[PDB]
Amino acid sequence: SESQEDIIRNIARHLAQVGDSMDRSIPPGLV
Amino acid sequence: AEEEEDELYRQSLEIISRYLREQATGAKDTKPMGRSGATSRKALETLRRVGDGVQRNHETAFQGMLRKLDIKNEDDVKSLSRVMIHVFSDGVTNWGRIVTLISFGAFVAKHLKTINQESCIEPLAESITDVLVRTKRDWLVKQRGWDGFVEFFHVEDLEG
């Protein structure tokens, strides 16, 4: 059940993605 | 007496460290009696707004990552480091990534403290600042670093 390697990998890609998009549209009126 | 000193590093480790520490402790350690760190105040402010926001809006991402991650010792630190590098391995860098990462970092740290694990906060702060300034220093210095972020986000709250 799950593998830290895969876990960390998926989380990592997700982290970069979440951040990459969080800049394209800041919910808090970008301020 | 030789060109090498970098306030960015010191200011980064100082801010990040004092951040996770003061944020993961819940207390208030504002006893400088000499310091100030203007950029630090503004920068932090930005981190408070954008940070709290992502925490409230993207709370699902933080919780999920933590749920899968699950950490209780410095050992995993190397694994976390791997995660960071694994995300930067692409070559994409921006305020979005940095803040998102830093945010998740602090959160996990908060949990670490809640689970009586402050000793694992050291690797957290050092790791974040390490990867950020070790592989992405050029990006920071290229976009002004902290200031450029305060300008890109803007936090003007003055009337006159």
Short mmCIF file of C-alpha atoms in Angstrom, two decimals:
data_model
loop_
_atom_site.label_atom_id
_atom_site.label_comp_id
_atom_site.label_asym_id
_atom_site.label_seq_id
_atom_site.Cartn_x
_atom_site.Cartn_y
_atom_site.Cartn_z
CA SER A 1 0.00 0.00 0.00
CA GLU A 2 1.56 3.23 -1.27
CA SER A 3 5.29 3.82 -1.48
CA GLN A 4 7.03 6.82 0.06
CA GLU A 5 9.00 7.02 -3.16
CA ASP A 6 5.84 7.26 -5.27
CA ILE A 7 4.16 9.29 -2.53
CA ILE A 8 6.90 11.90 -2.34
CA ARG A 9 7.11 11.89 -6.13
CA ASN A 10 3.39 12.52 -6.61
CA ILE A 11 3.30 15.03 -3.79
CA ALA A 12 6.32 16.79 -5.25
CA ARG A 13 4.84 17.14 -8.74
CA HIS A 14 1.60 18.25 -7.09
CA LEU A 15 3.44 20.84 -4.99
CA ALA A 16 5.17 22.43 -7.98
CA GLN A 17 1.88 22.35 -9.88
CA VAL A 18 -0.13 23.88 -7.04
CA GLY A 19 2.42 26.66 -6.75
CA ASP A 20 2.79 27.15 -10.49
CA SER A 21 -0.96 27.75 -10.74
CA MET A 22 -1.38 29.66 -7.47
CA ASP A 23 0.52 32.50 -9.16
CA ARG A 24 -1.53 32.49 -12.36
CA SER A 25 -4.53 33.54 -10.27
CA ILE A 26 -4.25 34.75 -6.67
CA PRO A 27 -7.69 34.30 -4.98
CA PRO A 28 -7.03 37.02 -2.34
CA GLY A 29 -7.27 39.78 -4.94
CA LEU A 30 -3.54 39.25 -5.49
CA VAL A 31 -3.09 41.33 -2.34
CA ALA B 1 37.24 42.61 3.83
CA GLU B 2 36.38 40.47 0.80
CA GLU B 3 33.42 40.42 -1.58
CA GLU B 4 31.29 37.42 -0.63
CA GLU B 5 28.88 38.44 2.14
CA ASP B 6 25.21 37.97 1.24
CA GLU B 7 22.42 39.57 3.26
CA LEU B 8 19.91 37.52 1.26
CA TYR B 9 21.11 34.29 2.88
CA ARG B 10 21.25 35.60 6.44
CA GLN B 11 17.95 37.44 6.04
CA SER B 12 16.39 34.33 4.51
CA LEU B 13 17.51 31.90 7.22
CA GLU B 14 16.73 34.49 9.90
CA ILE B 15 13.21 35.16 8.61
CA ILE B 16 12.34 31.55 7.74
CA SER B 17 13.77 30.26 11.03
CA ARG B 18 12.08 32.89 13.18
CA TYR B 19 8.96 32.25 11.10
CA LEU B 20 8.51 28.51 11.61
CA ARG B 21 9.71 28.94 15.18
CA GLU B 22 7.34 31.76 16.17
CA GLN B 23 4.55 30.25 14.06
CA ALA B 24 5.03 26.67 15.26
CA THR B 25 5.36 27.81 18.88
CA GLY B 26 2.28 30.01 19.02
CA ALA B 27 4.17 32.41 21.27
CA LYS B 28 5.63 35.83 20.60
CA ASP B 29 9.38 36.36 20.51
CA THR B 30 9.62 40.03 19.55
CA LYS B 31 12.56 41.16 21.67
CA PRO B 32 15.12 42.70 19.27
CA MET B 33 15.62 46.10 20.93
CA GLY B 34 17.77 47.02 17.95
CA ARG B 35 16.73 45.11 14.83
CA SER B 36 13.85 45.89 12.46
CA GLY B 37 14.13 44.27 9.05
CA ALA B 38 11.83 46.51 7.00
CA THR B 39 11.83 44.12 4.06
CA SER B 40 11.21 41.42 6.65
CA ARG B 41 8.08 43.15 7.93
CA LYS B 42 6.69 43.74 4.44
CA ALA B 43 7.77 40.31 3.21
CA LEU B 44 6.21 38.57 6.20
CA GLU B 45 3.02 40.57 5.69
CA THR B 46 2.83 39.22 2.15
CA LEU B 47 3.44 35.73 3.52
CA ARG B 48 0.64 36.27 6.04
CA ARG B 49 -1.92 37.25 3.40
CA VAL B 50 -0.88 34.82 0.65
CA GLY B 51 0.01 32.20 3.23
CA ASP B 52 -3.24 32.31 5.18
CA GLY B 53 -5.08 32.43 1.88
CA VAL B 54 -3.53 29.32 0.36
CA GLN B 55 -3.98 27.69 3.76
CA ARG B 56 -7.69 28.51 3.70
CA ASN B 57 -8.26 28.03 -0.03
CA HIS B 58 -5.76 25.25 -0.79
CA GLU B 59 -6.14 23.72 2.70
CA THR B 60 -7.06 20.53 0.83
CA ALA B 61 -3.62 20.39 -0.80
CA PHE B 62 -1.78 20.90 2.48
CA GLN B 63 -3.86 18.33 4.35
CA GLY B 64 -3.54 15.81 1.53
CA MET B 65 0.23 16.18 1.21
CA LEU B 66 0.63 15.91 4.98
CA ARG B 67 -1.71 12.91 5.17
CA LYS B 68 0.40 11.04 2.63
CA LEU B 69 3.69 12.51 3.83
CA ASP B 70 3.37 11.88 7.58
CA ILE B 71 6.60 12.76 9.38
CA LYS B 72 7.85 12.30 12.95
CA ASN B 73 11.67 12.37 12.71
CA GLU B 74 14.51 14.21 10.97
CA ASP B 75 15.17 11.01 9.00
CA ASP B 76 12.40 11.83 6.51
CA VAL B 77 14.10 15.21 6.03
CA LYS B 78 16.20 13.64 3.26
CA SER B 79 12.97 12.36 1.73
CA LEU B 80 11.41 15.80 1.95
CA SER B 81 14.53 17.29 0.40
CA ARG B 82 14.07 14.79 -2.41
CA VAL B 83 10.50 16.06 -2.85
CA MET B 84 11.59 19.70 -3.14
CA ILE B 85 14.36 18.92 -5.62
CA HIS B 86 11.95 16.63 -7.47
CA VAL B 87 9.58 19.58 -7.93
CA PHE B 88 12.29 22.04 -8.98
CA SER B 89 13.89 19.41 -11.24
CA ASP B 90 11.55 20.67 -13.98
CA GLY B 91 13.03 24.15 -14.14
CA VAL B 92 9.93 26.20 -13.34
CA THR B 93 10.28 28.96 -10.74
CA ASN B 94 8.05 31.81 -9.57
CA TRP B 95 6.38 33.43 -6.56
CA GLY B 96 3.63 30.82 -6.84
CA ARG B 97 5.96 27.88 -6.31
CA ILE B 98 8.10 29.48 -3.60
CA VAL B 99 5.13 30.65 -1.51
CA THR B 100 3.25 27.38 -2.08
CA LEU B 101 6.28 25.36 -0.98
CA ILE B 102 7.17 27.58 1.97
CA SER B 103 3.51 27.45 3.02
CA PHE B 104 3.30 23.65 2.99
CA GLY B 105 6.60 23.62 4.86
CA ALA B 106 5.39 25.79 7.72
CA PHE B 107 2.14 23.81 7.97
CA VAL B 108 3.93 20.48 8.30
CA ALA B 109 6.15 22.18 10.86
CA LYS B 110 3.10 23.33 12.82
CA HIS B 111 2.01 19.70 12.97
CA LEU B 112 5.53 18.67 14.01
CA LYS B 113 5.26 20.96 17.02
CA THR B 114 1.75 19.72 17.81
CA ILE B 115 3.21 16.21 17.86
CA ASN B 116 6.08 17.30 20.10
CA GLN B 117 8.68 17.29 17.33
CA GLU B 118 10.47 20.65 17.18
CA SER B 119 13.84 19.02 16.53
CA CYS B 120 12.52 18.27 13.04
CA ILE B 121 11.89 21.98 12.39
CA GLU B 122 15.59 22.72 11.94
CA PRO B 123 15.82 20.55 8.78
CA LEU B 124 12.57 22.13 7.62
CA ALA B 125 13.80 25.73 7.64
CA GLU B 126 17.35 24.89 6.54
CA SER B 127 16.05 22.56 3.82
CA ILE B 128 13.68 25.14 2.34
CA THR B 129 16.22 27.97 2.42
CA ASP B 130 18.91 25.55 1.25
CA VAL B 131 17.19 24.33 -1.92
CA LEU B 132 15.74 27.78 -2.64
CA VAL B 133 19.08 29.61 -2.38
CA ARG B 134 21.24 26.71 -3.58
CA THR B 135 19.47 25.90 -6.86
CA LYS B 136 17.22 28.96 -7.29
CA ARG B 137 19.40 31.79 -5.96
CA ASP B 138 19.84 33.22 -9.47
CA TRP B 139 16.07 33.43 -9.88
CA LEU B 140 15.69 35.29 -6.58
CA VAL B 141 18.56 37.69 -7.24
CA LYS B 142 17.24 38.17 -10.77
CA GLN B 143 13.75 39.22 -9.64
CA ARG B 144 15.03 41.33 -6.71
CA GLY B 145 14.30 38.45 -4.34
CA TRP B 146 12.15 39.60 -1.43
CA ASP B 147 11.45 43.20 -2.49
CA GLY B 148 10.44 42.18 -6.01
CA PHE B 149 7.89 39.93 -4.32
CA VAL B 150 6.51 42.77 -2.21
CA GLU B 151 6.17 44.79 -5.41
CA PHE B 152 4.74 41.91 -7.43
CA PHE B 153 2.19 41.28 -4.67
CA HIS B 154 1.85 44.85 -3.39
CA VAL B 155 0.85 45.43 0.23
CA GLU B 156 0.13 49.16 0.35
CA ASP B 157 -2.03 49.96 3.38
CA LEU B 158 -1.35 53.68 3.81
CA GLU B 159 -3.85 56.51 3.40
CA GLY B 160 -1.67 59.61 3.38
#
